[PDB]
PDB file of C-alpha atoms and ligand atoms in Angstrom:
ATOM      1  CA  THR K   2      -0.053 -21.951 -33.766  1.00 40.47           C
ATOM      2  CA  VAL K   3      -0.494 -24.669 -36.518  1.00 38.35           C
ATOM      3  CA  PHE K   4       2.386 -27.238 -36.840  1.00 38.45           C
ATOM      4  CA  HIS K   5       2.787 -28.982 -40.272  1.00 38.76           C
ATOM      5  CA  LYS K   6       3.078 -32.838 -40.615  1.00 40.53           C
ATOM      6  CA  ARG K   7       5.739 -31.996 -43.315  1.00 35.11           C
ATOM      7  CA  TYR K   8       8.456 -30.973 -40.769  1.00 36.78           C
ATOM      8  CA  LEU K   9       7.256 -33.134 -37.800  1.00 35.15           C
ATOM      9  CA  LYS K  10       9.359 -36.388 -37.638  1.00 37.25           C
ATOM     10  CA  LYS K  11       8.595 -38.893 -34.817  1.00 39.30           C
ATOM     11  CA  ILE K  12      11.573 -39.828 -32.525  1.00 42.93           C
ATOM     12  CA  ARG K  13       9.904 -42.095 -29.907  1.00 47.00           C
ATOM     13  CA  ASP K  14       6.845 -42.530 -27.627  1.00 45.96           C
ATOM     14  CA  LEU K  15       6.946 -40.928 -24.119  1.00 43.87           C
ATOM     15  CA  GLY K  16       3.834 -42.706 -22.747  1.00 47.82           C
ATOM     16  CA  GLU K  17       0.011 -43.062 -22.620  1.00 47.13           C
ATOM     17  CA  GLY K  18      -2.214 -40.301 -21.193  1.00 46.49           C
ATOM     18  CA  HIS K  19      -6.016 -40.658 -20.718  1.00 46.19           C
ATOM     19  CA  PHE K  20      -6.718 -40.320 -24.492  1.00 44.32           C
ATOM     20  CA  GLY K  21      -3.924 -41.834 -26.623  1.00 43.05           C
ATOM     21  CA  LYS K  22      -0.123 -41.633 -26.837  1.00 45.82           C
ATOM     22  CA  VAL K  23       2.316 -38.828 -25.911  1.00 44.50           C
ATOM     23  CA  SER K  24       5.271 -38.882 -28.362  1.00 44.77           C
ATOM     24  CA  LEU K  25       8.566 -36.963 -28.885  1.00 44.46           C
ATOM     25  CA  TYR K  26       8.921 -35.232 -32.307  1.00 42.16           C
ATOM     26  CA  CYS K  27      11.678 -33.028 -33.747  1.00 37.96           C
ATOM     27  CA  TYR K  28       9.903 -30.142 -35.563  1.00 36.42           C
ATOM     28  CA  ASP K  29      12.594 -29.116 -38.143  1.00 35.32           C
ATOM     29  CA  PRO K  30      11.150 -26.743 -40.820  1.00 33.58           C
ATOM     30  CA  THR K  31      14.790 -25.958 -41.946  1.00 33.24           C
ATOM     31  CA  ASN K  32      15.345 -29.756 -42.544  1.00 33.03           C
ATOM     32  CA  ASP K  33      18.805 -29.417 -40.803  1.00 35.99           C
ATOM     33  CA  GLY K  36      14.630 -27.632 -35.085  1.00 34.56           C
ATOM     34  CA  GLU K  37      12.382 -27.335 -31.963  1.00 35.56           C
ATOM     35  CA  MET K  38      11.769 -30.647 -30.027  1.00 36.68           C
ATOM     36  CA  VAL K  39       8.045 -31.028 -28.968  1.00 37.57           C
ATOM     37  CA  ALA K  40       5.745 -33.409 -27.008  1.00 36.74           C
ATOM     38  CA  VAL K  41       2.718 -34.382 -29.199  1.00 37.18           C
ATOM     39  CA  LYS K  42      -0.390 -35.953 -27.542  1.00 38.92           C
ATOM     40  CA  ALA K  43      -2.681 -37.727 -30.097  1.00 38.91           C
ATOM     41  CA  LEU K  44      -6.150 -39.370 -30.211  1.00 38.72           C
ATOM     42  CA  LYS K  45      -5.838 -43.199 -30.866  1.00 36.23           C
ATOM     43  CA  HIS K  52     -13.228 -40.576 -26.051  1.00 34.34           C
ATOM     44  CA  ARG K  53     -13.576 -38.091 -29.019  1.00 34.68           C
ATOM     45  CA  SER K  54     -15.720 -35.781 -26.728  1.00 33.80           C
ATOM     46  CA  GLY K  55     -13.240 -35.915 -23.763  1.00 31.39           C
ATOM     47  CA  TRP K  56     -10.214 -35.491 -26.125  1.00 31.26           C
ATOM     48  CA  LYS K  57     -11.693 -32.269 -27.687  1.00 30.44           C
ATOM     49  CA  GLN K  58     -12.043 -31.068 -24.015  1.00 33.10           C
ATOM     50  CA  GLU K  59      -8.342 -31.635 -23.090  1.00 35.69           C
ATOM     51  CA  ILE K  60      -7.367 -29.442 -26.165  1.00 34.51           C
ATOM     52  CA  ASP K  61      -9.810 -26.590 -25.236  1.00 33.81           C
ATOM     53  CA  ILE K  62      -8.691 -26.725 -21.527  1.00 32.64           C
ATOM     54  CA  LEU K  63      -4.876 -26.656 -22.015  1.00 32.59           C
ATOM     55  CA  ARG K  64      -5.373 -23.946 -24.755  1.00 34.58           C
ATOM     56  CA  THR K  65      -6.911 -21.681 -21.986  1.00 34.01           C
ATOM     57  CA  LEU K  66      -4.273 -22.398 -19.223  1.00 34.00           C
ATOM     58  CA  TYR K  67      -1.036 -20.316 -18.876  1.00 32.21           C
ATOM     59  CA  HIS K  68       1.069 -20.745 -15.662  1.00 30.47           C
ATOM     60  CA  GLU K  69       4.717 -21.485 -14.700  1.00 30.67           C
ATOM     61  CA  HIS K  70       3.624 -24.819 -13.076  1.00 30.99           C
ATOM     62  CA  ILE K  71       1.318 -25.909 -15.974  1.00 33.01           C
ATOM     63  CA  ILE K  72       2.854 -27.716 -19.023  1.00 34.02           C
ATOM     64  CA  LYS K  73       3.247 -25.130 -21.902  1.00 29.71           C
ATOM     65  CA  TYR K  74       0.660 -25.465 -24.736  1.00 28.94           C
ATOM     66  CA  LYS K  75       2.258 -24.667 -28.161  1.00 27.08           C
ATOM     67  CA  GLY K  76      -0.347 -25.554 -30.815  1.00 30.39           C
ATOM     68  CA  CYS K  77      -2.533 -28.119 -32.656  1.00 31.26           C
ATOM     69  CA  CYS K  78      -1.295 -30.249 -35.641  1.00 30.42           C
ATOM     70  CA  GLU K  79      -4.279 -31.125 -37.966  1.00 28.30           C
ATOM     71  CA  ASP K  80      -3.732 -34.973 -37.957  1.00 28.97           C
ATOM     72  CA  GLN K  81      -5.240 -36.460 -41.200  1.00 30.72           C
ATOM     73  CA  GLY K  82      -4.675 -40.001 -39.710  1.00 32.23           C
ATOM     74  CA  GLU K  83      -7.366 -39.665 -36.911  1.00 33.67           C
ATOM     75  CA  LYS K  84      -9.648 -36.903 -38.473  1.00 26.72           C
ATOM     76  CA  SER K  85      -8.783 -34.602 -35.469  1.00 26.95           C
ATOM     77  CA  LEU K  86      -6.027 -32.363 -33.927  1.00 25.87           C
ATOM     78  CA  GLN K  87      -2.928 -33.563 -32.020  1.00 27.96           C
ATOM     79  CA  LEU K  88      -2.042 -31.470 -28.904  1.00 25.42           C
ATOM     80  CA  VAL K  89       1.553 -30.067 -29.265  1.00 25.15           C
ATOM     81  CA  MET K  90       3.208 -29.164 -25.886  1.00 23.47           C
ATOM     82  CA  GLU K  91       6.752 -28.308 -24.650  1.00 24.83           C
ATOM     83  CA  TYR K  92       9.220 -31.254 -24.292  1.00 29.83           C
ATOM     84  CA  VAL K  93      10.739 -31.843 -20.795  1.00 33.82           C
ATOM     85  CA  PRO K  94      13.152 -34.815 -21.073  1.00 36.88           C
ATOM     86  CA  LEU K  95      13.441 -35.393 -17.249  1.00 31.41           C
ATOM     87  CA  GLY K  96       9.795 -36.666 -17.509  1.00 28.33           C
ATOM     88  CA  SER K  97       7.451 -37.373 -14.555  1.00 28.95           C
ATOM     89  CA  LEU K  98       8.403 -37.336 -10.843  1.00 24.59           C
ATOM     90  CA  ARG K  99       7.341 -41.050 -10.932  1.00 24.38           C
ATOM     91  CA  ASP K 100      10.102 -41.606 -13.617  1.00 23.56           C
ATOM     92  CA  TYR K 101      12.753 -39.295 -12.058  1.00 21.73           C
ATOM     93  CA  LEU K 102      12.501 -39.741  -8.206  1.00 22.84           C
ATOM     94  CA  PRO K 103      13.207 -43.533  -8.094  1.00 26.36           C
ATOM     95  CA  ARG K 104      16.682 -42.831  -9.758  1.00 27.27           C
ATOM     96  CA  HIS K 105      17.629 -39.458  -8.053  1.00 28.83           C
ATOM     97  CA  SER K 106      18.042 -39.170  -4.190  1.00 28.27           C
ATOM     98  CA  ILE K 107      16.289 -35.701  -4.019  1.00 30.85           C
ATOM     99  CA  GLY K 108      16.589 -33.950  -0.556  1.00 31.53           C
ATOM    100  CA  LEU K 109      13.552 -33.040   1.670  1.00 32.39           C
ATOM    101  CA  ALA K 110      13.692 -29.246   0.902  1.00 33.30           C
ATOM    102  CA  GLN K 111      13.571 -29.899  -2.873  1.00 32.08           C
ATOM    103  CA  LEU K 112      10.572 -32.285  -2.453  1.00 32.39           C
ATOM    104  CA  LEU K 113       8.702 -29.506  -0.500  1.00 32.85           C
ATOM    105  CA  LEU K 114       9.559 -26.905  -3.260  1.00 31.59           C
ATOM    106  CA  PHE K 115       7.944 -29.400  -5.758  1.00 32.74           C
ATOM    107  CA  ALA K 116       4.875 -29.658  -3.424  1.00 33.99           C
ATOM    108  CA  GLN K 117       4.719 -25.814  -3.114  1.00 37.27           C
ATOM    109  CA  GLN K 118       4.884 -25.575  -6.960  1.00 37.86           C
ATOM    110  CA  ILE K 119       2.044 -28.191  -7.504  1.00 40.50           C
ATOM    111  CA  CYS K 120      -0.185 -26.169  -5.066  1.00 39.07           C
ATOM    112  CA  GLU K 121       0.535 -22.862  -6.938  1.00 37.66           C
ATOM    113  CA  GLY K 122      -0.492 -24.480 -10.286  1.00 37.87           C
ATOM    114  CA  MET K 123      -3.568 -26.205  -8.728  1.00 39.97           C
ATOM    115  CA  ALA K 124      -4.570 -22.855  -7.024  1.00 42.43           C
ATOM    116  CA  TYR K 125      -4.407 -21.333 -10.544  1.00 42.56           C
ATOM    117  CA  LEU K 126      -6.419 -24.250 -12.068  1.00 42.98           C
ATOM    118  CA  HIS K 127      -9.165 -23.891  -9.346  1.00 46.40           C
ATOM    119  CA  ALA K 128      -9.218 -20.049  -9.864  1.00 51.00           C
ATOM    120  CA  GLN K 129      -9.983 -20.789 -13.601  1.00 50.07           C
ATOM    121  CA  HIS K 130     -12.852 -23.099 -12.340  1.00 51.65           C
ATOM    122  CA  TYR K 131     -11.311 -26.480 -13.387  1.00 50.27           C
ATOM    123  CA  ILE K 132     -10.756 -29.739 -11.420  1.00 50.20           C
ATOM    124  CA  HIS K 133      -7.766 -31.961 -12.402  1.00 49.95           C
ATOM    125  CA  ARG K 134      -9.253 -35.366 -11.288  1.00 50.12           C
ATOM    126  CA  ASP K 135      -5.847 -37.204 -11.659  1.00 50.57           C
ATOM    127  CA  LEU K 136      -3.365 -35.169  -9.568  1.00 48.41           C
ATOM    128  CA  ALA K 137      -0.692 -37.882  -9.210  1.00 47.16           C
ATOM    129  CA  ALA K 138       3.155 -38.001  -9.344  1.00 48.63           C
ATOM    130  CA  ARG K 139       2.775 -39.638 -12.850  1.00 51.62           C
ATOM    131  CA  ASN K 140       1.133 -36.335 -14.095  1.00 51.72           C
ATOM    132  CA  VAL K 141       3.741 -33.883 -12.629  1.00 52.53           C
ATOM    133  CA  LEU K 142       6.708 -33.244 -15.028  1.00 52.09           C
ATOM    134  CA  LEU K 143      10.199 -31.904 -14.019  1.00 53.49           C
ATOM    135  CA  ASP K 144      11.488 -29.024 -16.266  1.00 57.15           C
ATOM    136  CA  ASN K 145      14.649 -28.733 -14.052  1.00 56.79           C
ATOM    137  CA  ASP K 146      16.110 -29.570 -10.535  1.00 54.52           C
ATOM    138  CA  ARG K 147      13.813 -26.911  -8.874  1.00 56.31           C
ATOM    139  CA  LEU K 148      10.827 -26.493 -11.342  1.00 57.03           C
ATOM    140  CA  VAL K 149       7.801 -28.882 -11.790  1.00 54.91           C
ATOM    141  CA  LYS K 150       4.868 -28.569 -14.293  1.00 54.24           C
ATOM    142  CA  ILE K 151       1.433 -30.325 -14.100  1.00 56.74           C
ATOM    143  CA  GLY K 152       0.681 -32.378 -17.258  1.00 55.41           C
ATOM    144  CA  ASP K 153      -2.088 -34.809 -18.385  1.00 52.20           C
ATOM    145  CA  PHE K 154      -5.365 -32.764 -18.227  1.00 52.34           C
ATOM    146  CA  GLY K 155      -7.160 -35.779 -19.801  1.00 48.16           C
ATOM    147  CA  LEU K 156      -9.681 -36.008 -16.867  1.00 49.49           C
ATOM    148  CA  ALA K 157      -9.775 -32.190 -16.111  1.00 52.76           C
ATOM    149  CA  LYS K 158     -13.393 -30.740 -16.170  1.00 53.69           C
ATOM    150  CA  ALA K 159     -14.963 -27.205 -16.003  1.00 54.92           C
ATOM    151  CA  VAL K 160     -17.028 -26.870 -12.740  1.00 50.44           C
ATOM    152  CA  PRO K 161     -20.358 -25.090 -13.583  1.00 52.05           C
ATOM    153  CA  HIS K 164     -21.793 -25.682  -8.569  1.00 50.84           C
ATOM    154  CA  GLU K 165     -18.887 -26.675  -6.193  1.00 53.86           C
ATOM    155  CA  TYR K 166     -18.387 -30.154  -7.830  1.00 54.87           C
ATOM    156  CA  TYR K 167     -18.666 -32.158 -11.073  1.00 57.24           C
ATOM    157  CA  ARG K 168     -20.795 -35.364 -11.187  1.00 57.32           C
ATOM    158  CA  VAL K 169     -18.315 -37.952 -12.681  1.00 60.42           C
ATOM    159  CA  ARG K 170     -19.403 -41.408 -14.080  1.00 57.65           C
ATOM    160  CA  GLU K 171     -18.251 -45.033 -13.408  1.00 59.25           C
ATOM    161  CA  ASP K 172     -17.541 -45.189 -17.198  1.00 55.83           C
ATOM    162  CA  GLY K 173     -13.844 -44.016 -17.065  1.00 56.56           C
ATOM    163  CA  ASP K 174     -10.266 -45.117 -16.043  1.00 55.48           C
ATOM    164  CA  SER K 175     -10.679 -43.720 -12.451  1.00 53.38           C
ATOM    165  CA  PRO K 176      -7.506 -43.484 -10.308  1.00 53.17           C
ATOM    166  CA  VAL K 177      -9.383 -44.738  -7.155  1.00 52.65           C
ATOM    167  CA  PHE K 178      -6.121 -44.903  -5.060  1.00 51.96           C
ATOM    168  CA  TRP K 179      -5.762 -41.027  -5.390  1.00 52.52           C
ATOM    169  CA  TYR K 180      -9.510 -40.352  -4.682  1.00 51.50           C
ATOM    170  CA  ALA K 181     -11.478 -38.989  -1.656  1.00 51.78           C
ATOM    171  CA  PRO K 182     -14.420 -41.005  -0.173  1.00 51.01           C
ATOM    172  CA  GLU K 183     -16.986 -38.581  -1.722  1.00 52.35           C
ATOM    173  CA  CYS K 184     -15.548 -39.368  -5.240  1.00 52.55           C
ATOM    174  CA  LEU K 185     -15.575 -43.180  -4.581  1.00 53.36           C
ATOM    175  CA  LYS K 186     -19.112 -43.221  -2.963  1.00 50.93           C
ATOM    176  CA  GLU K 187     -21.268 -40.332  -4.293  1.00 51.60           C
ATOM    177  CA  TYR K 188     -19.436 -39.821  -7.665  1.00 52.34           C
ATOM    178  CA  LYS K 189     -19.179 -36.047  -6.869  1.00 53.25           C
ATOM    179  CA  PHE K 190     -15.765 -34.406  -7.568  1.00 52.02           C
ATOM    180  CA  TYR K 191     -15.166 -31.180  -5.506  1.00 50.68           C
ATOM    181  CA  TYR K 192     -12.171 -28.740  -5.551  1.00 46.64           C
ATOM    182  CA  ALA K 193     -11.496 -30.399  -2.144  1.00 47.02           C
ATOM    183  CA  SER K 194     -11.216 -33.844  -3.946  1.00 46.18           C
ATOM    184  CA  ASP K 195      -8.133 -32.509  -5.871  1.00 44.47           C
ATOM    185  CA  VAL K 196      -6.616 -31.481  -2.442  1.00 44.47           C
ATOM    186  CA  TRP K 197      -7.005 -35.141  -1.252  1.00 42.26           C
ATOM    187  CA  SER K 198      -5.202 -36.277  -4.490  1.00 39.81           C
ATOM    188  CA  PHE K 199      -2.472 -33.687  -3.677  1.00 37.25           C
ATOM    189  CA  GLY K 200      -2.036 -35.322  -0.223  1.00 38.89           C
ATOM    190  CA  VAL K 201      -1.447 -38.718  -1.978  1.00 39.87           C
ATOM    191  CA  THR K 202       0.909 -37.024  -4.527  1.00 37.49           C
ATOM    192  CA  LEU K 203       2.793 -35.489  -1.520  1.00 41.90           C
ATOM    193  CA  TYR K 204       2.962 -39.064  -0.026  1.00 43.26           C
ATOM    194  CA  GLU K 205       4.469 -40.279  -3.411  1.00 39.89           C
ATOM    195  CA  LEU K 206       7.109 -37.412  -3.374  1.00 41.13           C
ATOM    196  CA  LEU K 207       8.308 -38.323   0.168  1.00 42.85           C
ATOM    197  CA  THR K 208       8.597 -42.077  -0.838  1.00 39.88           C
ATOM    198  CA  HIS K 209      10.620 -41.063  -3.994  1.00 38.11           C
ATOM    199  CA  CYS K 210       7.717 -42.767  -5.892  1.00 40.11           C
ATOM    200  CA  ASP K 211       9.030 -46.188  -4.640  1.00 39.67           C
ATOM    201  CA  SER K 212       6.740 -48.880  -6.262  1.00 39.06           C
ATOM    202  CA  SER K 213       6.675 -51.022  -3.048  1.00 38.61           C
ATOM    203  CA  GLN K 214       5.533 -47.803  -1.196  1.00 37.73           C
ATOM    204  CA  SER K 215       2.876 -46.809  -3.852  1.00 37.86           C
ATOM    205  CA  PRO K 216      -0.807 -46.069  -2.942  1.00 38.37           C
ATOM    206  CA  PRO K 217      -2.169 -49.015  -4.993  1.00 38.42           C
ATOM    207  CA  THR K 218       0.438 -51.374  -3.400  1.00 39.30           C
ATOM    208  CA  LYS K 219      -0.257 -50.075   0.172  1.00 36.76           C
ATOM    209  CA  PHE K 220      -4.114 -49.890  -0.126  1.00 38.56           C
ATOM    210  CA  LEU K 221      -4.311 -53.465  -1.673  1.00 40.07           C
ATOM    211  CA  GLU K 222      -1.908 -54.569   1.154  1.00 38.97           C
ATOM    212  CA  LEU K 223      -4.627 -53.330   3.638  1.00 37.10           C
ATOM    213  CA  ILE K 224      -7.679 -54.616   1.582  1.00 35.17           C
ATOM    214  CA  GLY K 225      -6.236 -57.731  -0.163  1.00 33.60           C
ATOM    215  CA  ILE K 226      -7.020 -59.340  -3.570  1.00 36.84           C
ATOM    216  CA  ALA K 227      -9.377 -62.184  -2.410  1.00 38.16           C
ATOM    217  CA  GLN K 228     -12.547 -60.198  -3.463  1.00 36.05           C
ATOM    218  CA  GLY K 229     -11.504 -57.837  -6.330  1.00 34.40           C
ATOM    219  CA  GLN K 230     -15.165 -56.982  -7.208  1.00 32.90           C
ATOM    220  CA  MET K 231     -15.266 -54.775  -4.004  1.00 29.62           C
ATOM    221  CA  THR K 232     -11.751 -53.140  -3.891  1.00 28.37           C
ATOM    222  CA  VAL K 233     -13.646 -49.759  -4.054  1.00 27.18           C
ATOM    223  CA  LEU K 234     -16.219 -50.711  -1.317  1.00 28.59           C
ATOM    224  CA  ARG K 235     -13.359 -51.989   0.941  1.00 28.14           C
ATOM    225  CA  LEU K 236     -11.248 -48.863   0.117  1.00 30.43           C
ATOM    226  CA  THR K 237     -14.235 -46.561   0.916  1.00 29.65           C
ATOM    227  CA  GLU K 238     -14.876 -48.323   4.284  1.00 28.02           C
ATOM    228  CA  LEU K 239     -11.091 -48.316   5.206  1.00 27.96           C
ATOM    229  CA  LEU K 240     -11.024 -44.494   4.571  1.00 27.37           C
ATOM    230  CA  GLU K 241     -14.380 -43.822   6.477  1.00 27.00           C
ATOM    231  CA  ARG K 242     -12.961 -45.809   9.506  1.00 27.00           C
ATOM    232  CA  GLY K 243     -10.096 -43.213   9.342  1.00 29.88           C
ATOM    233  CA  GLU K 244      -7.194 -45.442   8.159  1.00 31.13           C
ATOM    234  CA  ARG K 245      -4.611 -43.696   5.949  1.00 31.67           C
ATOM    235  CA  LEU K 246      -1.396 -44.410   3.981  1.00 28.78           C
ATOM    236  CA  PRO K 247       1.452 -44.532   6.551  1.00 29.61           C
ATOM    237  CA  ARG K 248       4.089 -41.842   7.353  1.00 30.66           C
ATOM    238  CA  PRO K 249       6.942 -42.195   4.775  1.00 31.85           C
ATOM    239  CA  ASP K 250      10.477 -42.894   6.218  1.00 32.60           C
ATOM    240  CA  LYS K 251      12.153 -39.541   7.137  1.00 30.35           C
ATOM    241  CA  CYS K 252       8.839 -37.627   6.478  1.00 33.28           C
ATOM    242  CA  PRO K 253       8.700 -34.989   9.286  1.00 31.50           C
ATOM    243  CA  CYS K 254       5.724 -35.237  11.747  1.00 35.66           C
ATOM    244  CA  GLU K 255       4.594 -31.709  10.579  1.00 36.95           C
ATOM    245  CA  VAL K 256       4.425 -32.741   6.863  1.00 38.31           C
ATOM    246  CA  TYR K 257       2.495 -35.995   7.686  1.00 35.94           C
ATOM    247  CA  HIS K 258      -0.030 -33.813   9.702  1.00 37.60           C
ATOM    248  CA  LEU K 259      -0.465 -31.590   6.553  1.00 36.25           C
ATOM    249  CA  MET K 260      -0.844 -34.842   4.498  1.00 32.64           C
ATOM    250  CA  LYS K 261      -3.586 -36.038   6.957  1.00 31.37           C
ATOM    251  CA  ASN K 262      -5.251 -32.554   6.778  1.00 30.99           C
ATOM    252  CA  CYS K 263      -5.467 -33.112   2.959  1.00 30.35           C
ATOM    253  CA  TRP K 264      -7.002 -36.585   3.731  1.00 29.72           C
ATOM    254  CA  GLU K 265      -9.888 -35.225   5.887  1.00 27.67           C
ATOM    255  CA  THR K 266     -13.009 -37.470   5.411  1.00 26.41           C
ATOM    256  CA  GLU K 267     -15.136 -34.260   5.410  1.00 27.00           C
ATOM    257  CA  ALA K 268     -14.223 -32.269   2.245  1.00 25.48           C
ATOM    258  CA  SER K 269     -15.056 -28.827   3.837  1.00 25.67           C
ATOM    259  CA  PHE K 270     -12.327 -29.461   6.562  1.00 24.31           C
ATOM    260  CA  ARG K 271      -9.548 -29.923   3.899  1.00 20.39           C
ATOM    261  CA  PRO K 272      -7.428 -26.788   3.193  1.00 19.28           C
ATOM    262  CA  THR K 273      -7.703 -25.177  -0.285  1.00 18.23           C
ATOM    263  CA  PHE K 274      -4.502 -24.890  -2.418  1.00 17.61           C
ATOM    264  CA  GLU K 275      -4.330 -21.112  -1.572  1.00 22.10           C
ATOM    265  CA  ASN K 276      -4.234 -22.227   2.144  1.00 21.70           C
ATOM    266  CA  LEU K 277      -1.382 -24.767   1.500  1.00 22.77           C
ATOM    267  CA  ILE K 278       0.919 -22.388  -0.499  1.00 27.34           C
ATOM    268  CA  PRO K 279       2.186 -20.277   2.477  1.00 27.05           C
ATOM    269  CA  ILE K 280       2.425 -23.402   4.726  1.00 29.18           C
ATOM    270  CA  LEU K 281       4.621 -25.218   2.093  1.00 27.99           C
ATOM    271  CA  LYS K 282       6.580 -21.929   1.440  1.00 30.55           C
ATOM    272  CA  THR K 283       7.366 -21.795   5.207  1.00 32.08           C
ATOM    273  CA  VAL K 284       8.017 -25.576   5.725  1.00 29.81           C
ATOM    274  CA  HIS K 285      10.339 -25.436   2.597  1.00 24.20           C
ATOM    275  CA  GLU K 286      12.330 -22.517   4.152  1.00 26.47           C
ATOM    276  CA  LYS K 287      12.857 -24.573   7.402  1.00 25.34           C
ATOM    277  CA  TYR K 288      14.524 -27.778   5.978  1.00 25.75           C
ATOM    278  CA  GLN K 289      16.507 -25.594   3.483  1.00 20.40           C
TER     279      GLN K 289
HETATM  280  C1  OV5 J   1      10.499 -43.949 -18.638  1.00 20.52           C
HETATM  281  C2  OV5 J   1      11.374 -42.668 -18.848  1.00 20.52           C
HETATM  282  N1  OV5 J   1      10.456 -41.540 -19.029  1.00 20.52           N
HETATM  283  C3  OV5 J   1      10.795 -40.586 -19.913  1.00 20.52           C
HETATM  284  O1  OV5 J   1      11.840 -40.649 -20.565  1.00 20.52           O
HETATM  285  C4  OV5 J   1       9.920 -39.530 -20.162  1.00 20.52           C
HETATM  286  C5  OV5 J   1      10.463 -38.267 -20.344  1.00 20.52           C
HETATM  287  C6  OV5 J   1       9.629 -37.197 -20.641  1.00 20.52           C
HETATM  288  C7  OV5 J   1       8.249 -37.334 -20.777  1.00 20.52           C
HETATM  289  N2  OV5 J   1       7.554 -36.210 -21.059  1.00 20.52           N
HETATM  290  C8  OV5 J   1       6.203 -36.107 -21.004  1.00 20.52           C
HETATM  291  C9  OV5 J   1       5.333 -37.059 -20.443  1.00 20.52           C
HETATM  292  C10 OV5 J   1       3.958 -36.860 -20.457  1.00 20.52           C
HETATM  293  C11 OV5 J   1       3.093 -37.804 -19.886  1.00 20.52           C
HETATM  294  C12 OV5 J   1       2.983 -39.113 -20.392  1.00 20.52           C
HETATM  295  F1  OV5 J   1       3.674 -39.527 -21.489  1.00 20.52           F
HETATM  296  C13 OV5 J   1       2.136 -40.038 -19.783  1.00 20.52           C
HETATM  297  C14 OV5 J   1       1.393 -39.685 -18.667  1.00 20.52           C
HETATM  298  C15 OV5 J   1       1.511 -38.403 -18.156  1.00 20.52           C
HETATM  299  C16 OV5 J   1       2.353 -37.458 -18.740  1.00 20.52           C
HETATM  300 CL1  OV5 J   1       2.412 -35.841 -17.972  1.00 20.52          CL
HETATM  301  N3  OV5 J   1       3.474 -35.701 -21.016  1.00 20.52           N
HETATM  302  C17 OV5 J   1       4.359 -34.768 -21.554  1.00 20.52           C
HETATM  303  C18 OV5 J   1       5.688 -34.978 -21.534  1.00 20.52           C
HETATM  304  C19 OV5 J   1       6.223 -33.906 -22.130  1.00 20.52           C
HETATM  305  O2  OV5 J   1       7.422 -33.712 -22.300  1.00 20.52           O
HETATM  306  N4  OV5 J   1       5.279 -33.046 -22.496  1.00 20.52           N
HETATM  307  C20 OV5 J   1       4.113 -33.591 -22.141  1.00 20.52           C
HETATM  308  N5  OV5 J   1       7.730 -38.569 -20.636  1.00 20.52           N
HETATM  309  C21 OV5 J   1       8.546 -39.688 -20.327  1.00 20.52           C
END
């Protein structure tokens, strides 16, 4: 379980999660070696939580935990996870014309992993394309559990103190700072919107929501976003997104949380929709 700093040579950075950098290391005990993703602390309370969460989770659509490397440089542990060089769907989809059936297999896979995460009484709180990694052409894994919390209750009371991804968030999260299982389903709807736009930047939630709100009064982007969503306005139907999928997307974006489907509801619908366009 314990990786040694001795045989752990840094190759490059992969990116920034919620607490500190994700980096590529070759772990070569032989000195002639397994390649691993290492998340590090640059906060200290939330970081300890990501370690304890991912150490509990085992699923084919959750990023593989490997171990903890006792990092003398930050007086803490680094999280060591499997390396997947294809990276995030936000990285991959803009440069690979993936067909509709494959995108729905990805969406089925996210729901299976999220169904598992809910079953273990955890919310994700940043289910976005940027946090879904591609292991291969037809397998995705959820990463970044930096904002994930244990539900005690049907929701966690979040704070304003935090790097909140407001463009992926349900009205109840934005207004009443309550995060329900049903709030992760709304985030899934936005993620599904990202998949069907091949995570095109010009088509992104922040781009499209600020296109509706504007930038003239930035101190109420949230208030304007909350009102826009309560008046029933939604991100548009992506080019070549089937009517049926957009309806499922809108069902995930139900203003009332109790009217959104659970992930266990979505799985057989996405299974069946996948089969059709295949
Ligand atoms: C710009 C090109 N992008 C890549 O070349 C690339 C390839 C693989 C990659 N892998 C990531 C990326 C993350 C990660 C991150 F760095 C920032 C935010 C969210 C996530 Cl899920 N986490 C893990 C991994 C990984 O292999 N194991 C864990 N990251 C980037």
